[PDB]
Amino acid sequence: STQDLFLPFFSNVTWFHDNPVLPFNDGVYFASTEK
């Protein structure tokens, strides 16, 4: 068991598809499509 900064399960994540600036807030999870 560890206790660090983590992405909570089942959280709401924004989807965007000319890109708006976003604040940092202690790390970000970045995922790109398979394309």
Partner 1 sequence: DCALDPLSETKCTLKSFTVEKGIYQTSNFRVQPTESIVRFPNICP
From residue 6 to residue 35, the character string flagging contacts with partner 1 as x (rule: CB under 8 A) and all else as - is x-xxx-------------------------
Contact by Cβ (8 Å): 5, 27: yes
Closer to partner 1 by CB, 6 or 30: give it: 6
Closer to partner 1 by CB, 12 or 33: give it: 12
Q: Among candidates 24, 26, 28, which has minimal Cα distance to 11?
A: 28
Tell me how far CA of residue 1 lies from CA of 4, 9, 33, in angstroms: 10, 16, 31
Residues that bind partner 1 (CB under 8 A): 1, 6, 8-10
